Design an enzyme around this catalytic site. Sequence first.
Site, PDB file in Angstrom:
ATOM      1  N   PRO A  28       0.832  -1.205   0.000  1.00  0.00           N
ATOM      2  CG  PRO A  28      -0.844  -1.514   1.611  1.00  0.00           C
ATOM      3  CD  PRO A  28       0.440  -2.136   1.075  1.00  0.00           C
ATOM      4  CE  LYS A  76      -2.823  -5.375   1.148  1.00  0.00           C
ATOM      5  NZ  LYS A  76      -2.965  -6.268  -0.036  1.00  0.00           N
ATOM      6  CB  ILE A 114      -3.751  -4.654  -3.894  1.00  0.00           C
ATOM      7  CG1 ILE A 114      -2.950  -3.832  -4.914  1.00  0.00           C
ATOM      8  CG2 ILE A 114      -4.440  -5.833  -4.528  1.00  0.00           C
ATOM      9  CD1 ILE A 114      -1.699  -4.513  -5.383  1.00  0.00           C
ATOM     10  CG  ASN A 154      -9.681  11.497  -1.701  1.00  0.00           C
ATOM     11  OD1 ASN A 154     -10.762  11.648  -1.125  1.00  0.00           O
ATOM     12  ND2 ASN A 154      -9.170  12.398  -2.506  1.00  0.00           N
TER      13      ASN A 154
HETATM   14  C1  LIG Z   1      -8.488  -9.102  -4.835  1.00  0.00           C
HETATM   15  C2  LIG Z   1      -7.168  -8.631  -4.259  1.00  0.00           C
HETATM   16  N1  LIG Z   1      -7.501  -7.611  -3.257  1.00  0.00           N
HETATM   17  C3  LIG Z   1      -6.364  -9.765  -3.511  1.00  0.00           C
HETATM   18  O1  LIG Z   1      -6.903 -10.760  -3.071  1.00  0.00           O
HETATM   19  C4  LIG Z   1      -4.909  -9.489  -3.281  1.00  0.00           C
HETATM   20  C5  LIG Z   1      -4.412  -9.507  -1.981  1.00  0.00           C
HETATM   21  C6  LIG Z   1      -3.074  -9.219  -1.725  1.00  0.00           C
HETATM   22  C7  LIG Z   1      -2.213  -8.894  -2.786  1.00  0.00           C
HETATM   23  C8  LIG Z   1      -2.745  -8.881  -4.085  1.00  0.00           C
HETATM   24  O2  LIG Z   1      -1.946  -8.550  -5.143  1.00  0.00           O
HETATM   25  C9  LIG Z   1      -4.077  -9.175  -4.349  1.00  0.00           C
END
Ligand SMILES: C[C@@H](N)[C@H](O)c1cccc(O)c1
Lengths: 114, 114, 114
Positions: free
Chosen positions: C1, C32, C64, C97
């Site tokens: 992120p 993450k 993501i 945002n």
């Molecule tokens: C659908 C998407 N949010 C997913 O499951 C995901 C999770 C962690 C890393 C990614 O590249 C993709």
Amino acid sequence: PMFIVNTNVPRASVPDGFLSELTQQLAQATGKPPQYIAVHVVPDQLMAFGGSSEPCALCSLHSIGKIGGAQNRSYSKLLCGLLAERLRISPDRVYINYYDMNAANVGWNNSTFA
Amino acid sequence: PMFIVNTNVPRASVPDGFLSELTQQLAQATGKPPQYIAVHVVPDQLMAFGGSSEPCALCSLHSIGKIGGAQNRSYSKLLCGLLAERLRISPDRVYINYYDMNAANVGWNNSTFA
Amino acid sequence: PMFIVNTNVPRASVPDGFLSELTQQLAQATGKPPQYIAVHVVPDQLMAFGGSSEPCALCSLHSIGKIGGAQNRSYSKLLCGLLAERLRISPDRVYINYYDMNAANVGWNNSTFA
Ligand SMILES: C[C@@H](N)[C@H](O)c1cccc(O)c1
Ligand SMILES: C[C@H](N)[C@H](O)c1cccc(O)c1
Ligand SMILES: [Cl-]
Ligand SMILES: [Cl-]
Ligand SMILES: [Cl-]
Ligand SMILES: [Cl-]
Ligand SMILES: [Cl-]
Ligand SMILES: [Cl-]
Ligand SMILES: [Cl-]
Ligand SMILES: [Cl-]
Ligand SMILES: [Cl-]
């Protein structure tokens, strides 16, 4: 809403009161209260448009609603006019990206607007 | 299209002609006319990647079309290569966010592309 | 992120370790690994919020996944709390945002995450 302008024009060329003019003009154009309008001007940037370093601007407008085909055409005329009159930037060297934000995706004051 | 690079690499380490090189390489990669390609490089930033302040870059590419799975892989290889060769940034310390913009949401020259 | 803060607070008022603090708190909030969290703080900006230029911040969080109604409310409480305690910015003068990115639209390390 939030409006950001990034430009290679020097800081000294941004007139006094420019943030206030953007705030008021955007409040009128979007219909949103001025209390909810944030503005951000970033001069002296290392930028090119079409390969050329003549004055240019890259901008964005984020708003929860009040974004669409006709509205964005009107915003572009208003904002390009202001950048031309106040910053001396040609409208053909301005980009404005428009974002219609979901309230759930805008945080403020310890929460979101949803 | 519009390409923005934010980096902690100092301004003196951005080589001459870097905006032109980005403009030319992006025109070929995206197929868009060089006249419509805008580039913006922001050095000297206060940034970290993975908690570390070693050289890194956060970038974005906005384009009306020409965004997709395979195209974005190709852009990433091209752009990470340039950031590595020209700014000495390791590719595993670069993020590039890609945005496929609707024409109605891009202002330019007092109007939009819709 | 990726988390970006743009603020009019001066650089001297950004405390030591602020980037690390953001990285650690965001790793826990998003779930993450910290190795994947990038942070970018931009002080000394020319900005207004609601027509005035008391301290304010315009921010964004791209991830993501891990974006949604309840999660974004939680992120806003965490992030406004940090901006208040560390930068002395009132939560009612912060916008954040949120962007839920498709893996195919995030480049890294010469490819994308798709
Ligand atoms: C659908 C998407 N949010 C997913 O499951 C995901 C999770 C962690 C890393 C990614 O590249 C993709
Ligand atoms: C649907 C649209 N997003 C809407 O009706 C709205 C208006 C004003 C503020 C707000 O948060 C949400
Ligand atoms: Cl001003
Ligand atoms: Cl409309
Ligand atoms: Cl949204
Ligand atoms: Cl485009
Ligand atoms: Cl491929
Ligand atoms: Cl769009
Ligand atoms: Cl003020
Ligand atoms: Cl959620
Ligand atoms: Cl996306």
